Write a protein that holds these residues in place. Structure first.
Motif, PDB file in Angstrom:
ATOM      1  N   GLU A 223       0.833  -1.196   0.000  1.00  0.00           N
ATOM      2  CA  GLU A 223       0.000   0.000   0.000  1.00  0.00           C
ATOM      3  C   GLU A 223       0.869   1.247   0.000  1.00  0.00           C
ATOM      4  N   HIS A 225       0.134   5.462   0.639  1.00  0.00           N
ATOM      5  CA  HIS A 225      -0.831   6.512   0.953  1.00  0.00           C
ATOM      6  C   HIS A 225      -0.300   7.897   0.619  1.00  0.00           C
ATOM      7  N   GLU A 236       4.094   0.974   2.644  1.00  0.00           N
ATOM      8  CA  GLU A 236       3.821  -0.136   3.563  1.00  0.00           C
ATOM      9  C   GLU A 236       3.372  -1.425   2.865  1.00  0.00           C
TER      10      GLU A 236
HETATM   11 ZN   LIG Z   1      -2.910   1.293   4.945  1.00  0.00          ZN
END
Ligand SMILES: [Zn+2]
Length: 607
Positions: A223, A225, A236
């Motif tokens: 992921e 962000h 992550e």
């Molecule tokens: Zn997350």
């Protein structure tokens, strides 16, 4: 309000193994250029990355699409502001994409950085994609790795070429798509919906396609962000990737090979004596009638135009043949379901004479005149009179010689005959674990004569697999099973090879034939007497001639097909042999071939 986005990378594909564990496919490990894209890289930035990368890699056969040509043309920010200037952001990109001609002047060396620009441009923001190029060697890869820092985004990762191994099952394994050819185009939308990338490699053919869900490697997922603009904050990890799960087949290479050799041996024999001059080939399918496991699917194609012999194991599920007399069991079964016949009923075996058409005879023709015959005997002597009188009964008529036939009930009768046939697999879907089996040539336009020929196997065409399911159905006491070529799904051991069992593929019942148990026993008596009978009219004594176990079966009569199962008492093999357009009336190799396959299997797996 915080931005959410997750990216993925593919893993190694699971492998395919025969019944004994020999590998049928290869994952050959290689190294490739990878590119990781940032939301911040403009098209001009991408151009600069392509030109730097072109010094290190080789590009041979660039086949650029107009879409790619235009993307590269419009990358220049000034030329993009100018091309939209002369027109009457995503809609504005597409309309400006139909504004430039593709008759652009790019040198051949130019076409090479346009290709790479394309590859980088295809990669989604924050994702890591492969940049397809010519095979890279160890030294060439070490150069790129050392100067990667100078081209932010570029790295070296490990990929896998898929190759099929030279075996007799290589045709059945199917294909997987290239990383250059990418995800298949006419299916792109249905895969993206599943979770696939655009350049994923997926099964496009046969077993690779059918077990795609099992073979596809689990992906490592990350992921990312985004902050205010939509820029990367941190990277992550969600899931760690693994190699695909394995599949083991029900077919054993040794056995499959020995059946292929036996078919070639009989085919050349028949070719040599002239009997097989116009024969398209010979096909054989052996099933396990208790489970539906496929023991072998062999085929030999004879080209009628050049003369060449080629393997054709897929012919067993894609090619259709007139079945001949082997289907007599299904026609008698239809007589029982439609209340025409009662148990082991006696009919007169006589020539069948309809008005305005040639008399119908059996192989023995007039040699014995008219005589009483039972259903058991009808299978044993392979009688046309019996099944023709049965079919005529389904249509609502009793045979009288020279009768004018009314055809008011023809659609209903044909439907009932084909319906029964379908319960055995003849003209219906088999259930086999391949993406696309032929269900046979079953014509919707037909007449009375066709209905009658259909009764003795001279109209509807079926595949060798369908014929095998039919006799496996008789062997399994009317319970029809879906054939499966895969035995179980398997894990991997310590170094990417056949590990332990995850899920054994279990038997699947499709239907049960709607006849009595005693009626099924009458078909078993028939099939037994075909091979063990003592009459001059007994048709299949060749089944028994040098059999290591008791064989029951049915001959097909031009046409030398045969079906069989064994042993009679407790069947464990059921075979169908298809040998179309063989003119040898003298000796019939159909039964002999089936016997030998059964002997081959008994020597390999004792029964
Ligand atoms: Zn997350």
């Amino acid at each position: 309000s915080a931005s959410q986005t997750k990216v993925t990378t593919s893993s190694a594909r699971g492998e395919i193994y025969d019944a004994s564990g020999k590998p049928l496919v290869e994952n050959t490990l290689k190294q490739v250029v990878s590119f990781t894209r940032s939301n911040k890289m403009t098209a001009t930035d991408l151009k600069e990355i392509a030109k730097k990368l072109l010094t290190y890699v080789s590009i041979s056969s660039p086949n650029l699409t107009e879409r790619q040509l235009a993307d590269y043309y419009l990358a220049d920010p000034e030329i993009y502001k100018k091309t939209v200037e002369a027109l009457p952001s995503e809609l504005y990109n597409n309309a400006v994409d139909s504004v430039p001609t593709s008759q652009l002047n790019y040198t051949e060396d130019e076409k090479k950085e346009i290709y790479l620009f394309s590859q980088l441009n295809a990669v989604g923001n924050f994702a890591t994609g492969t940049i397809a190029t010519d095979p890279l060697n160890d030294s060439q890869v070490a150069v790129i790795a050392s100067i990667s820092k100078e081209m932010p985004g570029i790295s070296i990762s490990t990929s896998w070429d898929r190759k099929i191994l030279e075996t007799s099952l290589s045709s059945i394994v199917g294909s997987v798509s290239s990383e250059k050819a990418g995800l298949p185009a006419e299916e792109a939308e249905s895969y993206l919906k599943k979770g696939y990338s655009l350049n994923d490699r997926v099964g496009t053919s046969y077993l690779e396609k059918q077990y795609e869900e099992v073979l596809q490697g689990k992906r490592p997922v990350k992921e990312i962000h985004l902050d205010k603009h939509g820029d990367m904050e941190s990277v992550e990890n969600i899931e760690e990737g693994s190699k695909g799960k394995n599949i083991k087949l029900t077919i054993d290479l040794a056995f499959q090979d020995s059946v292929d050799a036996l078919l070639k041996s009989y085919f050349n024999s028949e070719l040599g004596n002239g009997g097989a001059k116009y024969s398209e080939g010979v096909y054989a399918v052996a099933l396990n009638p208790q489970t539906g496991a496929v023991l072998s699917m062999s085929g030999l194609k004879h080209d009628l135009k050049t003369g060449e012999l080629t393997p054709d194991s897929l012919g067993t599920v894609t090619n259709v043949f007139v079945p001949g007399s082997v289907v007599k069991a299904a026609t008698i079964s239809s007589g029982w379901e439609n209340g025409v016949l009662s148990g082991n009923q006696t009919l007169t075996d006589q020539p069948i004479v309809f008005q305005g058409s040639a008399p119908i005879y059996s192989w023995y023709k007039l040699a014995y005149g008219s005589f009483p015959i039972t259903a058991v005997e009808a299978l044993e002597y392979s009688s046309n009179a019996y099944v023709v009188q049965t079919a005529l009964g389904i249509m609502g008529q009793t045979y009288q010689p020279n009768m004018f036939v009314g055809t008011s009930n023809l659609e209903s009768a044909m439907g009932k005959l084909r319906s029964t046939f379908g319960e055995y697999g003849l003209g219906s879907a088999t259930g086999i674990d391949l993406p696309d089996e032929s269900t046979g040539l079953v014509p919707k336009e037909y007449n009375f004569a066709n209905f009658i020929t259909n009764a003795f196997g001279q109209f509807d065409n079926y595949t060798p697999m369908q014929l095998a399911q039919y006799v496996a159905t008789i062997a399994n006491n009317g319970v029809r099973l879906a054939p499966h070529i895969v035995e179980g799904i398997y894990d991997n051991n310590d170094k990417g090879g056949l590990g332990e069992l995850i899920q054994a593929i279990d038997t699947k019942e499709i239907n049960k034939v709607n006849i009595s148990e005693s009626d099924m026993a009458i078909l078993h008596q028939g099939f037994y007497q075909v091979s063990h009978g003592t009459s001059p009219l007994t048709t299949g004594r060749a089944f028994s001639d040098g059999a290591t176990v008791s064989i029951s079966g049915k001959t097909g009569t031009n046409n030398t097909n045969a079906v069989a199962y064994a042993p009679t008492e407790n069947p464990q093999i059921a075979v169908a042999v298809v040998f179309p357009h063989n003119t040898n009336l003298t000796k019939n190799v159909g039964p002999a071939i089936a016997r030998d396959i059964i002997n081959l299997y008994n020597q390999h797996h004792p029964m």
